[PDB]
Amino acid sequence: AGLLEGKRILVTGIITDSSIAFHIAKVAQEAGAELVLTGFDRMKLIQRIADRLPKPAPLLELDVQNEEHLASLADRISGAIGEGNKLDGVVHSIGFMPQTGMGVNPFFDAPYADVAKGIHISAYSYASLAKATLPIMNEGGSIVGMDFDPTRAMPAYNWMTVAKSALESVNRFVAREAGAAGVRSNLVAAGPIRTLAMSAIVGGALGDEAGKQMQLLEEGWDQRAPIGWNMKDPTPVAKTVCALLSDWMPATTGTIIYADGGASTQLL
Amino acid sequence: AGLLEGKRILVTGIITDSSIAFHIAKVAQEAGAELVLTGFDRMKLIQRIADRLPKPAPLLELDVQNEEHLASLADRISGAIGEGNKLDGVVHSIGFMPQTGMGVNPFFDAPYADVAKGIHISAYSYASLAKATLPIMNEGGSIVGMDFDPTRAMPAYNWMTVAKSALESVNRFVAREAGAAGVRSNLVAAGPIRTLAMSAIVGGALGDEAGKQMQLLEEGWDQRAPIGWNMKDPTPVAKTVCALLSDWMPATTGTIIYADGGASTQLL
Amino acid sequence: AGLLEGKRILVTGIITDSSIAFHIAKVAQEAGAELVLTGFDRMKLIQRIADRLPKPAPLLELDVQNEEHLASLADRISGAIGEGNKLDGVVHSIGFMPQTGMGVNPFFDAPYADVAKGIHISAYSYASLAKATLPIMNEGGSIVGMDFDPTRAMPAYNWMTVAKSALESVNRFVAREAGAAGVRSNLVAAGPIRTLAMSAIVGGALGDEAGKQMQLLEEGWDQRAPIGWNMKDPTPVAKTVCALLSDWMPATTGTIIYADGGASTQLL
Amino acid sequence: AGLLEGKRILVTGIITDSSIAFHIAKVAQEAGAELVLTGFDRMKLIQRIADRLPKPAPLLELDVQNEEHLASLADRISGAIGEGNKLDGVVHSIGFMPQTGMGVNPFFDAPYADVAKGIHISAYSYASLAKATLPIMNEGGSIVGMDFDPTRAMPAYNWMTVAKSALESVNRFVAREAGAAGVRSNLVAAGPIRTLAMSAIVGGALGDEAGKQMQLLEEGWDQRAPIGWNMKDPTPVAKTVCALLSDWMPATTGTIIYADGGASTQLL
Numbered sequence A, B, C, D: 001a002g003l004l005e006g007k008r009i010l011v012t013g014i015i016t017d018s019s020i021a022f023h024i025a026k027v028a029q030e031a032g033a034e035l036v037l038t039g040f041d042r043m044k045l046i047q048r049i050a051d052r053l054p055k056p057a058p059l060l061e062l063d064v065q066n067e068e069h070l071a072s073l074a075d076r077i078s079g080a081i082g083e084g085n086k087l088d089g090v091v092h093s094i095g096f097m098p099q100t101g102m103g104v105n106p107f108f109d110a111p112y113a114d115v116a117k118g119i120h121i122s123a124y125s126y127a128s129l130a131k132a133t134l135p136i137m138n139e140g141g142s143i144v145g146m147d148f149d150p151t152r153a154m155p156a157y158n159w160m161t162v163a164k165s166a167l168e169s170v171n172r173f174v175a176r177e178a179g180a181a182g183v184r185s186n187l188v189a190a191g192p193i194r195t196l197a198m199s200a201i202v203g204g205a206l207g208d209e210a211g212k213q214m215q216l217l218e219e220g221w222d223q224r225a226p227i228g229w230n231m232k233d234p235t236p237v238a239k240t241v242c243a244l245l246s247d248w249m250p251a252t253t254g255t256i257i258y259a260d261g262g263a264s265t266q267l268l
């Protein structure tokens, strides 16, 4: 009798247990969903993390830059869930930008090969993921991507901002294409979440002045947010993704839902 | 064991059973909610309508232009549900614009007294409703208003578009004020819904060319919408409102969720 | 041989020489324009101010809440400039919100009569000004309003933010109606400008903490702005308004041009 | 005594005399500007087109995908205008997407190498162009890019929409970086312009149904536009770019100005 009871959902993007996708996975299972997970590169590390989830789930290798991985993905998912079953949700929780395109490096100093890799992984793969999973998706199903509001420029985020702007545009076209199968596509735009990478920045991995500066951008996010914002708590985000994966927003597609405490809606 | 299990929700705006709020009410009860209804003016007609809902609920009179009605609302809800029980959600489903400000009358020809009445009922009252209900709202509660995407000008809607632009602005401030009580505020932007008033326009009550033109605007909304749009089916909208009333979007506030088939995200 | 050479332009909203419209007027005359000025209430104070402009211009009384003033405006401009000469531009530089709706008063505590007066003067009057002036406007003419970016809620501005959200909506409809006469309509969204009223706030007329807070909001606007922002310098805003009055943006209408140093495009 | 009198302006993007950059060049020279042109690939064809301009101008080869071309660009511009002179404007009028990413090809069927080439040329090069010309730009100077409103998905434009969404994001970061030199950056979002490529589509180069369909998207653009839209007339666009290159919008940066007849501001 759970929100996602009986739903079969692909969840990409787990690498640690601070991963947003880890908590999407956890909440989805606690809501009654059966999952199929995917991981990139460190497959053994990903299996160990995934065993900490409430329930076991099949894990599949997927490098979104790998054409062969994508071509076979739907075949491998179907064997996972059964030749006759189909997915009801797909969670895109994948991002990447080399340190030349995001960090202390000047914005003009990022070579395009690096930016191009970052946009491939972070934006284009939303479309290629949808292309690879839509043939085995049910009608009324739901594809959800993870966003960080790129409406305005900001320090450090740099070319990852540009990738997110691209991802928002891709989402609207995925919505169009998925719509013919009866499948919705949306993004969830989250506030900052303290992953292990994000702590490293507080710890100084890009400079000590930055750790303070970001620690104060986070305090400013909490100040702007009318209901506050706790960056150590990804659970609100995970619940929002499950909201989109459920049957309760059945006419919403091509859009961005903000799970950020309202901070985007307040000037200061 | 439902989405709004045990939640208490004020629902405003029922006048017919084609009313959007009627279907919000019906879906919310089927999802486990217990309601307090409000109605305006034709109180006996509204009780007749309310008797057709899945479950009984108290009906309170509320003219949002009436300061006395508003001042006493929290006390009268309290007497209905008990001065120890609190509200979990509030649904604003109220709009009005005189015929001078919306329809076939030239845009420049609407007198301000008419526009001001329209904006009072349609936008300001989202703030005065929230002010009158927040004292008896629980933490984590949810306030929801009905919107019609006014980002772009359009024929006929005229000053109601301006009232909706005003309402979107009010919602962000309500979000700020409600946030201190741990209460979220959002709007749902619905596509066209065939109410009795809307059928009158197709039936010609504003010119025969407009009924055709209207009938073709609806077919183009269904064409733009990647997953389609059925204007005779308010249920998708009602479900989305309940999605926002639930506990599954706990970090979302001050925003607009589009329940329009995705039509606003597609140019053509 | 200047930007507005030979153009005739109504300029509203002069009350002091710190008024934005005073600098619009001064720049427009230096660019070659010939003006008709309007003023409200303190007519003798405004003539004293108008005498300080580079060139003489007629002053007409205009209370935008006064239907008689508006009905006669085109005739009175005609008598000023000649019933065979037409206007080339109209500058709306008018705003007002009672202290209950903007400042230190709680957002929920503004009575609607006060909000309605504020929206009448600040937003509706952009439509009624345009309706009263278009009969005597030339093809290719330009109507320009002053805006303050209300996309996001913010402290103090409160119901004036809502009036500005309303004004942006009105501008798109004015654009539609003016378009049949070959007349453009746009808004300029300016950053904070130090008027006499604005200095009063820094000087403490709404609390000492607010003056500091205000003084720091201005320093953060200058920090966000990639090219900086000098709130003691209205000249950039006046130039932008003239840019829109000229013939160099002949396909731009219904939009908002940001004269804010770029601060609205940067998150921090 | 022209709008751009004495200004030195780099203009990229001429390939035919229907090129938007051709008309930007023409209007700029007619406004009193001295130019430096750049061309890609068919250098001899570009020289012949450029000789039809009102005044001669130095032409320089520039392939924005060519690191050596970019590194030397400022050296070659300086030799062109004089070792001691500097640019006052830079016009980015460059776009490209392979036929896999824009046209009749399904959206999901575009390989990333093609999308990546299109985003390199169409979006990233706005940043690399600015990086290569800013060292020789004066304070108060202006960089202008050409945009096509990608806020909503649309048929055919497909991955070029995504590139434009990326370009809008890049523009805001270029505004940030250029701001430290005192240089503004903006985009002009134009309505459809009948280039030779665009006529080919009307002529059937991608299918006859499309030629009618686009011919009717253009008639719909003219209908939405409150002041109309003439796609055979790029002069309004060119004038708008010159508006941004002038001294008259000196506090505008990071933004998009719409030269589209107002069509983006109207729903229908």
Ligand SMILES: NC(=O)c1ccc[n+]([C@@H]2O[C@H](COP(=O)([O-])OP(=O)(O)OC[C@H]3O[C@@H](n4cnc5c(N)ncnc54)[C@H](O)[C@@H]3O)[C@@H](O)[C@H]2O)c1
Pocket: A012, A013, A014, A015, A016, A018, A019, A020, A021, A039, A040, A062, A063, A064, A065, A092, A093, A094, A095, A096, A121, A146, A147, A148, A189, A190, A191, A192, A193, A194, A195, A197, A198
């Ligand atoms: N952390 C935040 O504050 C925050 C805020 C808003 C949005 N987001 C977004 O949420 C998503 C998840 O990021 P996160 O913060 O959980 O960090 P994360 O490092 O835990 O997750 C990113 C994931 O991307 C995967 N990935 C990278 N390259 C890949 C490839 N070639 N193929 C397949 N997978 C690949 C990694 O394996 C990893 O699991 C990203 O899209 C990110 O942009 C994060």
Ligand SMILES: NC(=O)c1ccc[n+]([C@@H]2O[C@H](COP(=O)([O-])OP(=O)(O)OC[C@H]3O[C@@H](n4cnc5c(N)ncnc54)[C@H](O)[C@@H]3O)[C@@H](O)[C@H]2O)c1
Pocket: B012, B013, B014, B015, B016, B018, B019, B020, B021, B039, B040, B062, B063, B064, B065, B092, B093, B094, B095, B096, B121, B146, B147, B148, B189, B190, B191, B192, B193, B194, B195, B197, B198
């Ligand atoms: N019908 C649509 O196509 C559509 C689309 C999008 C949004 N909406 C919005 O949905 C909401 C509900 O409208 P609807 O379409 O269900 O029509 P409706 O006529 O059924 O509901 C509007 C309600 O507002 C009430 N109301 C009017 N004046 C009032 C006052 N002074 N005090 C209190 N209540 C008052 C009426 O009694 C009525 O119940 C409105 O806000 C409307 O703008 C409607």
Ligand SMILES: NC(=O)c1ccc[n+]([C@@H]2O[C@H](COP(=O)([O-])OP(=O)(O)OC[C@H]3O[C@@H](n4cnc5c(N)ncnc54)[C@H](O)[C@@H]3O)[C@@H](O)[C@H]2O)c1
Pocket: C012, C013, C014, C015, C016, C018, C019, C020, C021, C039, C040, C062, C063, C064, C065, C092, C093, C094, C095, C096, C121, C146, C147, C148, C189, C190, C191, C192, C193, C194, C195, C197, C198
């Ligand atoms: N000052 C800023 O920081 C700032 C920033 C952005 C936008 N703006 C806008 O610029 C415009 C000009 O304001 P300002 O800052 O120059 O202040 P101001 O006080 O100098 O100008 C406002 C004008 O509105 C006039 N006005 C008020 N009620 C009127 C009525 N009933 N009829 C006619 N005119 C009436 C006043 O006489 C005054 O001349 C306003 O629309 C304001 O909201 C101001």
Ligand SMILES: NC(=O)c1ccc[n+]([C@@H]2O[C@H](COP(=O)([O-])OP(=O)(O)OC[C@H]3O[C@@H](n4cnc5c(N)ncnc54)[C@H](O)[C@@H]3O)[C@@H](O)[C@H]2O)c1
Pocket: D012, D013, D014, D015, D016, D018, D019, D020, D021, D039, D040, D062, D063, D064, D065, D092, D093, D094, D095, D096, D121, D146, D147, D148, D189, D190, D191, D192, D193, D194, D195, D197, D198
């Ligand atoms: N034509 C329209 O309807 C329209 C509408 C809005 C925006 N725009 C934009 O206006 C700009 C100009 O396009 P146009 O319509 O004038 O067409 P066009 O073909 O005349 O111009 C595009 C230019 O890009 C250049 N280019 C391509 N690859 C290049 C590279 N590697 N290095 C350098 N230059 C390269 C070509 O040489 C050409 O001059 C583009 O950015 C386009 O997206 C066009």
Ligand SMILES: CC1(C)CCC(Cc2cc(O)c(-c3ccccc3)c(=O)[nH]2)CC1
Pocket: A094, A095, A096, A097, A148, A154, A155, A156, A157, A160, A191, A192, A193, A195, A197, A198, A214, A217
């Ligand atoms: C300094 C800065 C603006 C603070 C907020 C964070 C939020 C954030 C977004 C984001 O997309 C990511 C991310 C990017 C790529 C791969 C994995 C994760 C992140 O770590 N953090 C981005 C950086």
Ligand SMILES: CC1(C)CCC(Cc2cc(O)c(-c3ccccc3)c(=O)[nH]2)CC1
Pocket: B094, B095, B096, B097, B148, B154, B155, B156, B157, B160, B191, B192, B193, B195, B197, B198, B214, B217
């Ligand atoms: C011609 C037009 C654009 C067709 C679509 C409709 C949608 C719509 C919105 C709306 O707010 C209402 C509405 C307004 C006031 C009170 C009750 C309902 C409506 O009836 N219809 C609005 C008019």
Ligand SMILES: CC1(C)CCC(Cc2cc(O)c(-c3ccccc3)c(=O)[nH]2)CC1
Pocket: C094, C095, C096, C097, C148, C154, C155, C156, C157, C160, C191, C192, C193, C195, C197, C198, C214, C217
């Ligand atoms: C605290 C706050 C955000 C600082 C910036 C200012 C900018 C501003 C806008 C504005 O519309 C006005 C204004 C309003 C009504 C009449 C005349 C002028 C203003 O004074 N100041 C608005 C208030």
Ligand SMILES: CC1(C)CCC(Cc2cc(O)c(-c3ccccc3)c(=O)[nH]2)CC1
Pocket: D094, D095, D096, D097, D148, D154, D155, D156, D157, D160, D191, D192, D193, D195, D197, D198, D214, D217
């Ligand atoms: C069918 C469609 C939406 C009609 C409108 C046009 C407008 C348009 C934009 C545009 O960026 C271009 C373009 C793209 C790449 C290189 C050169 C030019 C174009 O030709 N035409 C784009 C295609």
Ligand SMILES: [Cl-]
Pocket: A065, A066, A067, A068
């Ligand atoms: Cl590969």
Ligand SMILES: [Cl-]
Pocket: B065, B066, B067, B068
């Ligand atoms: Cl009353």
Ligand SMILES: [Cl-]
Pocket: C065, C066, C067, C068
């Ligand atoms: Cl009156």
Ligand SMILES: [Cl-]
Pocket: D065, D066, D067, D068
């Ligand atoms: Cl190279």
Ligand code: NA
Pocket: A222, A223, A224, A225, A226, A227, A228
């Ligand atoms: Na806060």
Ligand code: NA
Pocket: B222, B223, B224, B225, B226, B227, B228, B229
């Ligand atoms: Na459709």
Ligand code: NA
Pocket: C222, C223, C224, C225, C226, C227, C228, C229
């Ligand atoms: Na700055």
Ligand code: NA
Pocket: D222, D223, D224, D225, D226, D227, D228
């Ligand atoms: Na038209």
